[PDB]
Structure 1
Amino acid sequence: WELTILHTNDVHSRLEQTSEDSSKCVDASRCMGGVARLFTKVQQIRRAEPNVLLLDAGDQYQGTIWFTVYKGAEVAHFMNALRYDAMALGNHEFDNGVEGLIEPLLKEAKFPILSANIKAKGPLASQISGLYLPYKVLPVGDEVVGIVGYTSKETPFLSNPGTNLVFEDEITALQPEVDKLKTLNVNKIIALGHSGFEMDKLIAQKVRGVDVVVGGHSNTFLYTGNPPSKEVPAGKYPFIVTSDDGRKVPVVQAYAFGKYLGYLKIEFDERGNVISSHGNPILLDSSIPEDPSIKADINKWRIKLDDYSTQELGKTIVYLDGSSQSCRFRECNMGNLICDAMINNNLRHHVSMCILNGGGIRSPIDERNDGTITWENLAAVLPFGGTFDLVQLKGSTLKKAFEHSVHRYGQSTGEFLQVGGIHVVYDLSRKPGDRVVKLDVLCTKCRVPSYDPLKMDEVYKVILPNFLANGGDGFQMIKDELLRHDSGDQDINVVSTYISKMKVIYPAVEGRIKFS
């Protein structure tokens, strides 16, 4: 029995074709992605493949202005237009709250949204009951296929799902549902969830009954061949997990931002045992044309958004590297911009130091043609919308924060820190906690202001975002050890006023972060 699984994940409201760095498209001839382009390939596959399922493995919220304006409707309207079959809940579908998901998406969505490890209790459970399900049986061909959904068990520590929700462990919540499914004689079972390729490998091996594992949340790219763009692949597509019951479970994931459409052809038998499965992510590039019906429908909406973009801000002469591939591994100039901007707005209401988690930086801004910046640009960088809080810290506290900046370096980890007024040097041939080999911090009260070796028993004032000030990302030493805490100024607003003040900005890799 043939079954073709089309799957997306981590679109982040990039329903509009984007530059290769998944940021606002500048030259359509090179641009790729978008719901419109995705439509023409799904449509094409459905033309030739009688048995098909289209599934998104979470994270359609946030990313671009398309969300912070329609705050959900854009996802529901165009996921329905693309006629998705199922979707597992992601962590970003709670960034606007439990009500910021129930009213816009769950109610207006024409298809099931799945998650098995999310238990609802209290006054809220009354109605959200049945607005999402732990699974769903889908009739394909003359057979049936069962999807079981899961979400990250760290969403209440990554998003805003309120307190009337509980996020259980995925495996311990999926297996009871999967047993239920096979006692209903639904052998063909797909696991679709938002926990991360590493946790998806835990489910594939340690859940009996699962036939496929489709997932996301870590923006992982798998390929069997020669990759088509700048994303270097982790493993082959599908990756094969040798489960504990003696089975070859395919693990699949297609990068992010709607740049690739996952495609997995699966051959079953009567008892629903996966004989084999070949596939590969499909780069939705310029060769695949936008579908006019969708493309125009997109511009029916873009008209509303144009008001935020058509307003001028300032100019940039160099490319602003806000890419996760550089802002979580080395000194990216986007962070240096944000940190230099940070220490300008406070100077009107005596600090010189700045730390910033590269994970907060969510989009690059491609300097092009005239090198002009807009709110649509700055918004894609900082979708969270917080403030830059002033914090009094011990030197010992800052020392360990930078040991936390590289404590698990190498896994695209978002807690890697950008700097301003700080010179840090790492040596990764040392065990976590000995990696910082030099740290010279800029002093101001000194008569010769300059970078000097950090003293452990000294008081420094650093400006960092609210999310760090409260010990996010695992910086619990900051939240607990700080000597004072002051309120900040809206994050995107002040960076907008800064670059408007400058009128031209050229941040560079100045050697703030170095490696030994």
Structure 2
Amino acid sequence: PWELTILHTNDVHSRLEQTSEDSSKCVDASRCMGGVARLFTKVQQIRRAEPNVLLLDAGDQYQGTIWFTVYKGAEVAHFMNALRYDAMALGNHEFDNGVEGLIEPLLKEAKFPILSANISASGPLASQISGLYLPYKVLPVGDEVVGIVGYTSKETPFLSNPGTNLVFEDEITALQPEVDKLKTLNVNKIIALGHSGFEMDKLIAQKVRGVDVVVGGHSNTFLYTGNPPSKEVPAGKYPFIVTSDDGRKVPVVQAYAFGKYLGYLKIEFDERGNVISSHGNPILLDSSIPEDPSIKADINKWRIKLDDYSTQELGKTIVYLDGSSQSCRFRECNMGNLICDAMINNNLRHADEMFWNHVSMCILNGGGIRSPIDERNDGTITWENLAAVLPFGGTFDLVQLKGSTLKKAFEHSVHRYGQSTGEFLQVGGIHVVYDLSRKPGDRVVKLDVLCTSCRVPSYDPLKMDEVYKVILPNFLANGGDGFQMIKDELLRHDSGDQDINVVSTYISKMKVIYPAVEGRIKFS
């Protein structure tokens, strides 16, 4: 048999530096993890030992830390080139700075092919981008070749800023003709590498005839065979085996997010390109693996500009930004309004005639707001100031929630009101009235929400059976602060932009901010 070792990352999300165990800022180095310097060490070790290796990325290198804010993808090209990635699929966040912010720097600077078979362009853009990403690439590996066919979430227009020219086609529809073309070219070993989420990955494995392996991303899915090595709880075995409609067993892999793990899958192929066996597991990139000194020194050189940027003025406030717990855990606070307004602004995407914007609503737990910002430093706001407000390295995500779930969340917000607990909700696009004299669970007496399917935005009563898009911290989407109903009842969840970056961009665009307390939250 011919044995291939697939090394894979996905949803690295700008974690160029090593991180804490929870993928926030590294504080206690002896317990830090990931980063590209440590990844380099492990990849180099494996390449010394195994003859046939591919290093693949399933997208979403863009977005996640100040690295992306400052270097805008140049860090991705540089460090992925240093790691010698063999191929990458486009993720949704590769469109965060528009198609221009993808073409330059990433597509023009990567030394490896960048792939997606289900994105097409028209008009002048089609000529500008032709050949800069590809549906697939056939790569030599030893004396053999392996075809790698890419794909990107069809939902990218709702989850990034690709513009109005690009069209994202159904993944399976686009993939099948490319995989059949590869068969006619005598390519019998085919990896589908792409960025649509574990559920779509399983459908691709089932339905796209000729795919031998699926290497996915987007959903931050952790798969593991055996006892988990850290705190992530597996969603299934690694690999996850799909029985295909052609009657093959097709392994599906993913490797969590944030560069914490290196995916590692060994596949044995017969002479006709059929998978005989597949086995492996993601490797936890913990501190037992040394950071490569050369990569680490280059990381430290690149960090200088980040340190400089972090103390520069982003914009000004003419109001005190009240992020105190005494305010934000007890009543509407103007820091909460600012952050929710920034969240909504970050999620303005292109709209058809059926909505002014696809999402209009925001919730933010007061426990997530960790500092005020004083306006008496000549009004200046810096990144460092924002990092005191939002210190946990999270994202502001998009979910779909039934009205009944959202009502339960607002009841939870005040179920033990008066104790300065973190679950009290700041809001945008929502007007809530509580009556604290009522029993816990029955304190929400009015709950109105901003329409989306309307040409003039206005507030209407929340409807229990209707599904609402809401922007909220990943912490809450994951059930933090007791919001188990959100985790258990949500109907869709996609990871969004970094928390600080969302607020920084809004402040920079607005130039001068003056958020008020304006009656979004009232008490009878």
Q: TM-score, normalised by structure 1?
A: 0.69
Aligned to 2:140, what secondary structure does the other structure show? strand
Q: 1:157 to 1:411 in 2, by over 3 A?
A: farther
Distance 2:288 2:312 in 1: 32
Q: 1:331 to 1:278 in 2, by over 3 A?
A: farther
8 A contact 1:16–1:34 mirrored in 2 = yes
Q: 1:138 to 1:63 in 2, by over 3 A?
A: same
In the TM superposition, what whole-angstrom CA distance separates every residue of 1:306-330 from its partner, at most 9, and x where no partner exists? 1134679999999999999999999
8 A contact 1:64–1:379 mirrored in 2 = no
Aligned to 2:514: 506
In the TM superposition, what whole-angstrom CA distance separates every residue of 1:435-460 from its partner, at most 9, and x where no partner exists? 99997999999999999999999999
In the TM superposition, what whole-angstrom CA distance separates every residue of 1:397-438 from its partner, at most 9, and x where no partner exists? 996998999999999999998659999999999999999999
- Out of 216-225 and 459-468, give the one that drifted further: 459-468
Q: How far did 1:135 drift?
A: 0.2
Matches within 5 A, 1:105-144: 105-144=106-145
- Out of 464-473 and 13-22, give the one that drifted further: 464-473
8 A contact 2:219–2:494 mirrored in 1 = no
Q: 1:322 to 1:187 in 2, by over 3 A?
A: farther
Q: 1:409 to 1:345 in 2, by over 3 A?
A: same
In the TM superposition, what whole-angstrom CA distance separates every residue of 1:269-293 from its partner, at most 9, and x where no partner exists? 1001101111000011111010011
Q: 1:146 to 1:506 in 2, by over 3 A?
A: same
Aligned to 1:419, what secondary structure does the other structure show? strand
- Out of 486-495 and 374-383, give the one that drifted further: 486-495
Aligned to 1:152: 153
Distance 2:22 2:479 in 1: 30
Aligned to 2:426, what secondary structure does the other structure show? strand
- Out of 17-26 and 207-216, give the one that drifted further: 17-26
Q: How far did 1:133 drift?
A: 0.4
Aligned to 1:488: 496
Distance 1:225 1:429 in 2: 51
Identity %: 99
- Out of 200-209 and 410-419, give the one that drifted further: 410-419
Q: What is the aligned length?
A: 516
Distance 2:349 2:175 in 1: 54
Q: How far did 1:378 drift?
A: 3.9
8 A contact 2:24–2:392 mirrored in 1 = no
8 A contact 1:63–1:380 mirrored in 2 = no
In the TM superposition, what whole-angstrom CA distance separates every residue of 1:241-300 from its partner, at most 9, and x where no partner exists? 011101110000000000000000111110011011110000111110100110001111
Aligned to 1:107, what secondary structure does the other structure show? helix
Q: 1:187 to 1:324 in 2, by over 3 A?
A: farther
Aligned to 1:31: 32
Q: 1:34 to 1:471 in 2, by over 3 A?
A: closer
Aligned to 2:21, what secondary structure does the other structure show? coil
In the TM superposition, what whole-angstrom CA distance separates every residue of 1:86-140 from its partner, at most 9, and x where no partner exists? 0000110111010111020000111100000001111111120000100000110
Distance 1:281 1:438 in 2: 48
8 A contact 1:442–1:451 mirrored in 2 = yes
Q: 1:84 to 1:366 in 2, by over 3 A?
A: farther
Aligned to 1:6, what secondary structure does the other structure show? strand
8 A contact 1:308–1:376 mirrored in 2 = no
Q: 1:106 to 1:406 in 2, by over 3 A?
A: farther
Aligned to 1:488, what secondary structure does the other structure show? strand
- Out of 320-329 and 6-15, give the one that drifted further: 320-329
Q: 1:429 to 1:82 in 2, by over 3 A?
A: farther
Q: 1:440 to 1:18 in 2, by over 3 A?
A: same
In the TM superposition, what whole-angstrom CA distance separates every residue of 1:197-230 from its partner, at most 9, and x where no partner exists? 0000010000000000001001000000111111
- Out of 84-93 and 470-479, give the one that drifted further: 470-479
Q: How far did 1:156 drift?
A: 1.4
- Out of 320-329 and 199-208, give the one that drifted further: 320-329
- Out of 366-375 and 91-100, give the one that drifted further: 366-375
8 A contact 1:146–1:189 mirrored in 2 = yes
Q: How far did 1:160 drift?
A: 1.0
In the TM superposition, what whole-angstrom CA distance separates every residue of 1:70-100 from its partner, at most 9, and x where no partner exists? 1010000000000000000011011101011
- Out of 207-216 and 475-484, give the one that drifted further: 475-484
- Out of 306-315 and 229-238, give the one that drifted further: 306-315
Distance 2:416 2:137 in 1: 37
In the TM superposition, what whole-angstrom CA distance separates every residue of 1:135-190 from its partner, at most 9, and x where no partner exists? 00011011100000000001112111111211100000000000000111111100
Distance 1:196 1:326 in 2: 39
- Out of 444-453 and 492-501, give the one that drifted further: 444-453
- Out of 248-257 and 470-479, give the one that drifted further: 470-479
Distance 1:347 1:86 in 2: 31
8 A contact 2:157–2:349 mirrored in 1 = no
The RMSD of aligned alpha carbons is 10.8
Aligned to 1:457, what secondary structure does the other structure show? coil
Q: 1:61 to 1:332 in 2, by over 3 A?
A: farther
Q: How far did 1:24 drift?
A: 1.3
Q: 1:306 to 1:125 in 2, by over 3 A?
A: same
8 A contact 1:64–1:376 mirrored in 2 = no
In the TM superposition, what whole-angstrom CA distance separates every residue of 1:468-506 from its partner, at most 9, and x where no partner exists? 999999999999999999999999699789999999999
Q: 1:509 to 1:85 in 2, by over 3 A?
A: farther
8 A contact 1:21–1:323 mirrored in 2 = no
- Out of 359-368 and 120-129, give the one that drifted further: 359-368
8 A contact 1:263–1:280 mirrored in 2 = yes
Distance 1:193 1:486 in 2: 16
Q: 1:69 to 1:217 in 2, by over 3 A?
A: same
Distance 2:215 2:430 in 1: 42
- Out of 358-367 and 207-216, give the one that drifted further: 358-367
Distance 2:172 2:149 in 1: 11
Aligned to 1:156, what secondary structure does the other structure show? helix
Q: 1:149 to 1:457 in 2, by over 3 A?
A: closer
- Out of 502-511 and 293-302, give the one that drifted further: 502-511
Distance 2:365 2:45 in 1: 42
Distance 2:223 2:492 in 1: 46
Work out whether 1:253 is the aligned partner of 2:260: no
8 A contact 1:192–1:215 mirrored in 2 = yes
8 A contact 2:159–2:494 mirrored in 1 = no
Q: 1:120 to 1:344 in 2, by over 3 A?
A: closer
Aligned to 1:185, what secondary structure does the other structure show? coil
Distance 1:307 1:261 in 2: 31
8 A contact 2:58–2:89 mirrored in 1 = yes
Aligned to 2:112, what secondary structure does the other structure show? coil
Unaligned runs of 5+ in 2: 351-357
- Out of 55-64 and 499-508, give the one that drifted further: 499-508
8 A contact 1:23–1:364 mirrored in 2 = no
Q: 1:25 to 1:105 in 2, by over 3 A?
A: same
Distance 2:256 2:326 in 1: 13
- Out of 16-25 and 208-217, give the one that drifted further: 16-25
Distance 1:13 1:256 in 2: 10
8 A contact 1:118–1:151 mirrored in 2 = yes
8 A contact 2:65–2:501 mirrored in 1 = no
Q: How far did 1:355 drift?
A: 3.2
- Out of 53-62 and 399-408, give the one that drifted further: 399-408
